[PDB]
A paper describes a structure:
Based on their homology to ATP binding cassette (ABC) transmembrane transporters and the Rad50 DNA damage repair protein, the two globular ATPase “head” domains situated at the ends of ∼50-nm-long intra-molecular coiled coils of a heterodimer of condensin’s Smc2 and Smc4 subunits are thought to sandwich a pair of ATP molecules between composite catalytic sites, each composed of Walker A (P loop) and Walker B motifs of one head and a so-called ABC signature motif of the opposite head.
This finding is readily explained by the Ct Smc2hd structure, where the more pronounced flexion of the Smc2 helical lobe not only repositions the Q loop but also induces a cascade of structural displacement events that alter the P loop of the ATP-binding pocket into a conformation that is incompatible with nucleotide binding. The Smc2 head fails to bind ATP on its own, presumably because of the deformation of the Smc2 P loop observed in two different crystal forms, but readily binds and hydrolyses ATP when in complex with the Smc4 head.
Author numbering: 1 to 212, 989 to 1179
The structure:
């Protein structure tokens, strides 16, 4: 799936039906000086996707999202996303028969909302299942990168960064075999405790009494031989489980080691493309192990720096962005949104982001919402927004356009 069309009707600053068509399969930028008109395009997208962790499309009464809150001749709102669905390997399950898929979300007076799929009424859960089947995880969005995530990554502790790498390793789905092994061992341990309980409370006291008639001694003495032979065989069965667990802990540590090397390699190459001549790596802090966590180390130019605090604002954004993007491959999504990440960035830096997208993220659709104007001017498709007449208007352009 990839966005081909977005229609915004009676929603926030978009008073009149606005058909925004021509979305590029790889790289779109939303630009211009109309801050509200730009941001409302992202709002409209997140509103249809059902994003619940974005304050700008959240309200006690969603009538607030209708243009002028329903008081200026528009009493309903509608947003539609149209997706191309020709690539059947990336189709939502259960919708493969559609060459295109449209999802519409409506607001009426009072704030109740409804959904349509391909123009027909649809349950909210049907819409959410569709998006989740193509890895647009509305529950915990992987595909939306805001300034807050950049700041959060910049402030993570070594333990928190290693958590990301552990999380990316994909070995908690490995863990299922480990905890099945653990309780087949706990059952083995249980038998050992009841073997020693029998000896302690029953066999050994009786043998000591019988030894201080003569046929009863050897009857109990054989039972002490029985459970001893049993205790031995249980210990060795339990040991085979201990080896099984030892091998899964080994697979765990190798998978993480491999993930660390993959992320660290991509992270440093990405940062070198966003800040040419520079480099970065993920390393344990100093004289510490890998499971005490990983910290970001930066080489500005050819010189390694002791702390991230020594980087400019723009360099800091680029290093966090490079790590975020190096990790996308482990929770991949068919579209990615970079929302207003350019506050501290030069124009050359944002041009570098565009070439990174075009060369390294083929097969995904990027949508970049520019904070400043004049950035991301090499995007394959440019949507330029400005203010007029109590309604936003959108120009659809390319870098090759004369106007």
């Amino acid at each position: 799936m990839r966005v081909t069309e977005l229609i915004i009707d009676g929603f926030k600053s978009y008073a009149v039906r606005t058909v925004i068509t021509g979305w590029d399969e790889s790289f779109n930028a939303v630009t211009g000086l109309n801050g509200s008109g730009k941001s409302n395009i992202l709002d409209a997208i997140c509103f249809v996707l059902g994003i619940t962790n974005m304050s700008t499309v959240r309200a006690q009464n969603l009538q607030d999202l209708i243009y002028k809150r329903g008081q200026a001749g528009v009493t309903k709102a509608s947003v539609t996303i149209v997706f191309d669905n020709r690539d059947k390997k990336r189709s939502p399950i259960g919708f493969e028969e559609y060459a295109t898929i449209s999802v519409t979300r409506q607001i009426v007076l009072g704030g109740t909302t409804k959904y349509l799929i391909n123009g027909h009424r649809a349950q909210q859960q049907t819409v959410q299942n569709l998006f989740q089947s193509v890895q647009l995880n509305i529950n915990n969005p992987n595909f939306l990168i805001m300034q807050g995530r950049i700041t959060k990554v910049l402030n993570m502790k070594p333990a928190e960064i290693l958590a990301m790498i552990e999380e990316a390793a994909g070995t908690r789905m490995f863990e299922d075999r480990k905890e099945k092994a653990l309780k087949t061992m706990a059952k083995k341990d249980l038998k050992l405790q009841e073997i020693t309980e029998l000896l302690r409370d029953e066999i050994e006291p009786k043998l000591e009494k019988l030894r201080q008639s003569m046929n009863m001694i050897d009857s109990v003495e054989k039972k002490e031989m029985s459970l001893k032979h049993m205790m031995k065989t249980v210990l060795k069965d339990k040991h085979k489980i201990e080896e099984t667990i030892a091998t899964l802990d080994e697979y765990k540590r190798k998978a993480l080691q491999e993930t660390w090397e993959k992320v660290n390699g991509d992270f440093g190459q990405i940062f070198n493309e966003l800040l040419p001549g520079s480099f970065a790596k993920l390393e344990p802090p100093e004289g510490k192990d890998l499971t005490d966590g990983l910290e970001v180390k930066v080489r500005l130019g050819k010189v390694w720096k002791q702390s991230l605090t020594e980087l400019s604002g723009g360099q800091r954004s680029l290093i966090a962005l490079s790590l975020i993007m190096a990790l996308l491959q482990f929770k991949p999504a068919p579209m990615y949104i970079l929302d207003e990440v350019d506050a501290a960035l030069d124009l050359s830096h944002t041009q570098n982001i565009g070439r990174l997208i075009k060369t390294r993220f083929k097969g995904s659709q990027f949508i970049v919402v520019s904070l400043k104007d004049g950035m991301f001017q090499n995007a394959n498709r440019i949507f330029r927004v400005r203010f007029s007449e109590g309604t936003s208007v959108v120009q659809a352009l390319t870098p090759a356009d004369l106007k």
